[PDB]
Enzyme design. Structure first.
Site, short mmCIF file in Angstrom:
data_model
loop_
_atom_site.label_atom_id
_atom_site.label_comp_id
_atom_site.label_asym_id
_atom_site.label_seq_id
_atom_site.Cartn_x
_atom_site.Cartn_y
_atom_site.Cartn_z
N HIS A 98 0.81 -1.20 0.00
CA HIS A 98 0.00 0.00 0.00
C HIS A 98 0.84 1.25 0.00
O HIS A 98 2.07 1.16 0.18
CB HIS A 98 -1.05 0.00 1.19
N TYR B 181 -3.49 3.79 2.18
CA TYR B 181 -4.48 3.66 1.12
C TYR B 181 -3.96 2.71 0.05
O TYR B 181 -2.78 2.63 -0.22
CB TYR B 181 -4.87 5.03 0.41
N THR B 182 -4.88 2.06 -0.63
CA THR B 182 -4.53 1.17 -1.76
C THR B 182 -5.30 1.69 -2.96
O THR B 182 -6.53 1.67 -2.95
CB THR B 182 -4.98 -0.27 -1.44
C1 LIG Z 1 -4.07 -1.47 3.62
C2 LIG Z 1 -5.14 -0.40 3.81
C3 LIG Z 1 -5.72 0.17 2.67
C4 LIG Z 1 -6.77 1.11 2.80
N1 LIG Z 1 -7.29 1.58 1.64
C5 LIG Z 1 -8.33 2.51 1.71
C6 LIG Z 1 -8.95 3.06 0.57
O1 LIG Z 1 -8.68 2.71 -0.58
N2 LIG Z 1 -9.94 3.97 0.71
C7 LIG Z 1 -10.35 4.40 1.97
O2 LIG Z 1 -11.22 5.24 2.02
N3 LIG Z 1 -9.73 3.88 3.08
C8 LIG Z 1 -8.71 2.96 3.00
N4 LIG Z 1 -8.13 2.49 4.15
C9 LIG Z 1 -8.45 3.17 5.48
C10 LIG Z 1 -7.79 4.53 5.71
O3 LIG Z 1 -6.44 4.19 6.05
C11 LIG Z 1 -8.24 5.37 6.90
O4 LIG Z 1 -8.42 4.49 8.01
C12 LIG Z 1 -9.58 6.03 6.45
O5 LIG Z 1 -9.40 6.85 5.30
C13 LIG Z 1 -10.25 6.88 7.54
O6 LIG Z 1 -9.26 7.74 8.20
P1 LIG Z 1 -9.80 9.17 8.71
O7 LIG Z 1 -8.59 9.88 9.17
O8 LIG Z 1 -10.69 9.91 7.73
O9 LIG Z 1 -10.87 8.76 9.86
P2 LIG Z 1 -10.63 8.01 11.25
O10 LIG Z 1 -9.58 8.74 11.99
O11 LIG Z 1 -10.31 6.54 11.01
O12 LIG Z 1 -12.07 8.26 11.94
C14 LIG Z 1 -13.16 7.44 11.54
C15 LIG Z 1 -14.26 7.58 12.60
O13 LIG Z 1 -13.70 7.15 13.83
C16 LIG Z 1 -14.16 7.93 14.93
N5 LIG Z 1 -13.03 8.63 15.60
C17 LIG Z 1 -12.26 9.62 15.05
N6 LIG Z 1 -11.33 9.99 15.97
C18 LIG Z 1 -11.49 9.23 17.12
C19 LIG Z 1 -10.84 9.20 18.39
N7 LIG Z 1 -9.95 10.18 18.62
N8 LIG Z 1 -11.30 8.29 19.34
C20 LIG Z 1 -12.37 7.47 19.06
N9 LIG Z 1 -12.99 7.50 17.85
C21 LIG Z 1 -12.58 8.38 16.89
C22 LIG Z 1 -15.08 8.94 14.33
O14 LIG Z 1 -16.37 8.41 14.46
C23 LIG Z 1 -14.63 9.01 12.88
O15 LIG Z 1 -15.69 9.43 12.09
C24 LIG Z 1 -7.16 1.52 4.07
C25 LIG Z 1 -6.59 0.96 5.22
C26 LIG Z 1 -5.60 -0.02 5.07
C27 LIG Z 1 -4.98 -0.59 6.32
#
Ligand SMILES: Cc1cc2nc3c(=O)[nH]c(=O)nc-3n(C[C@H](O)[C@H](O)[C@H](O)COP(=O)(O)OP(=O)(O)OC[C@H]3O[C@@H](n4cnc5c(N)ncnc54)[C@H](O)[C@@H]3O)c2cc1C
Ligand SMILES: Cc1cc2nc3c(=O)[nH]c(=O)nc-3n(C[C@H](O)[C@H](O)[C@H](O)COP(=O)(O)OP(=O)(O)OC[C@H]3O[C@@H](n4cnc5c(N)ncnc54)[C@H](O)[C@@H]3O)c2cc1C
Ligand code: NA
Ligand code: NA
Lengths: 243, 243
Positions: free
Chosen positions: B47, B63-64
């Protein structure tokens, strides 16, 4: 001369003595040990593994009792009950006289007195039980110099488990401090508001360059986000531990 | 002779070309590579790592891309935007012409043809992207005999990302099958209903006694529950991987 209460390889049955309501979704479950003089005997940082049969399949979850290490003849679990949570629903349906199967101790945490100068603990909900077990062991040992800072996060004020206990520990011991965080605080709240932030952690814990171990337990999205904050703040994986 | 598009140690800037709405909370973002004949160059199973600055602090997420490995001069990310998700919010506020900082490749996966006889993949939501990258590679290899069974779980029917692509893969390749699961199924639905169950996994994947790897990606509570099921069914930790 008796065996320890738990065996790490073989499940034993322990009988439910009594239960009581803590709040809308939380209960306290008191189980008998097999002999009035037995104690659970979990090493610091280690837990019970519990098994149950639900719809003909065996399910497995970890639990940390809230009875102190030295309580004789019983152990107490505080369990939050989830709408579609198979094991908390199983336990919440047991009647006095029914059994729970338990083995242990389990867990990779490896405590030595004064292993670090500082522990930063981050707990959400029932994540407090593993933290309480470690903190109790540290503060009741008068040779331990470890400073413990706890960030304890919940949704509503009524979700804050063991508040009186924690407040008393903090009044009584210089080296233990608690910071409470609520998504929905009451007016006049002096603690944290919302989720746990990278700022809250930077304000309350020693920085990565110090001798710190950060420990986390809570719901999986909380653990995921704490790990994000510890990355943001410059800690390396060797410096943290998720239960 | 150009350098690879990503460097594992250093972030580089990649320009947002355009974006498109996919559904109420999902968008597809197209980023330019630095030369029109470049490919993103992620090995199978690996990734990219993105960084941004939010409120003075760096955050980092994986992200992938969903563009195929051979697309020239850009990569595509399909991203679900969460209400309090810092990175997905950051990415959704970029305008065309703005940059995203990316490094890579990252991850442990090491492709060998026919490393296992069977792959069980369990994806929720955007957890499909790492699964798609691996399955595309396998089905295009003439030497591959690996059977891939994918369980893909979502809340509503409009949340099923890449359905057209997955179903075309399943029709073209008898070694690839997909079972879709919805919490809120449409009238007439013949797939799984609810959360993914131990029985759904038992009915679709070969048993622990088989030569199987189970791969999971999804929201953290889905991944924790899937691990609960794999323990229930008797798989050992060496037989599964969470992205
Ligand atoms: C190998 C791999 C590939 C991936 N590929 C994709 C991809 O192609 N597309 C994609 O969209 N994602 C992908 N993901 C996931 C991506 O990495 C993130 O996890 C995702 O985009 C969300 O991150 P964010 O920062 O927007 O939200 P997050 O920080 O993960 O928040 C999500 C929700 O968690 C809660 N939250 C936020 N902060 C806290 C806290 N402080 N304590 C408790 N709860 C909280 C809230 O409800 C929030 O709305 C992938 C993950 C992996 C491991
Ligand atoms: C060291 C340690 C100590 C612990 N100590 C305690 C303790 O003292 N007290 C305590 O209450 N807990 C404790 N826990 C938590 C405990 O191990 C369980 O996680 C908890 O009891 C809930 O289990 P459950 O089976 O009831 O629900 P879970 O299975 O964890 O379900 C919880 C929620 O997840 C969602 N969900 C369920 N199934 C799925 C699925 N198939 N896919 C997607 N989402 C799903 C549902 O919304 C459900 O309500 C501890 C954990 C650890 C690691
Ligand atoms: Na969660
Ligand atoms: Na979650």
């Amino acid at each position: 001369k008796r065996e320890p209460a738990l065996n790490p390889n073989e499940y034993k049955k322990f009988m439910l003595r009594e239960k009581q309501i803590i709040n809308h979704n939380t209960r306290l479950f008191r189980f008998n040990l097999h002999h009035p003089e037995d104690v659970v005997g979990l090493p610091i940082g280690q837990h019970m593994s519990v098994k149950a049969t639900v719809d003909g399949k065996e399910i497995y979850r970890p639990y940390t009792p809230v009875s102190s290490d030295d309580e004789k003849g019983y152990f107490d679990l505080i369990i939050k009950v989830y709408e579609k949570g198979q094991m908390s629903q199983y336990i919440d349906h047991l009647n006095p006289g029914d059994f729970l199967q338990v083995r242990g101790p389990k867990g990779q945490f490896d405590y030595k007195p004064n292993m670090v100068k500082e522990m930063g603990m981050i707990a959400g909900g029932t994540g407090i039980t593993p933290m309480l077990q470690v903190a109790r062991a540290i503060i009741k040992n008068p040779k331990e110099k470890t400073i413990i800072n706890l960030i304890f996060a919940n949704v509503n004020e009524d979700d804050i488990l063991l508040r009186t206990e924690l407040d008393d520990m903090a009044k009584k011991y210089s080296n233990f401090k608690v910071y409470y965080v609520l998504n929905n605080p009451p007016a006049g709240w002096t603690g944290g508001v919302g989720f746990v932030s990278a700022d809250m952690i930077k304000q309350h814990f020693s920085p990565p360059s110090s001798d710190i171990k950060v420990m986390m337990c809570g719901p999986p999205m909380m653990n995921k986000a704490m790990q994000g904050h510890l990355e943001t703040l410059g800690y390396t994986p060797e410096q943290w531990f998720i239960f």
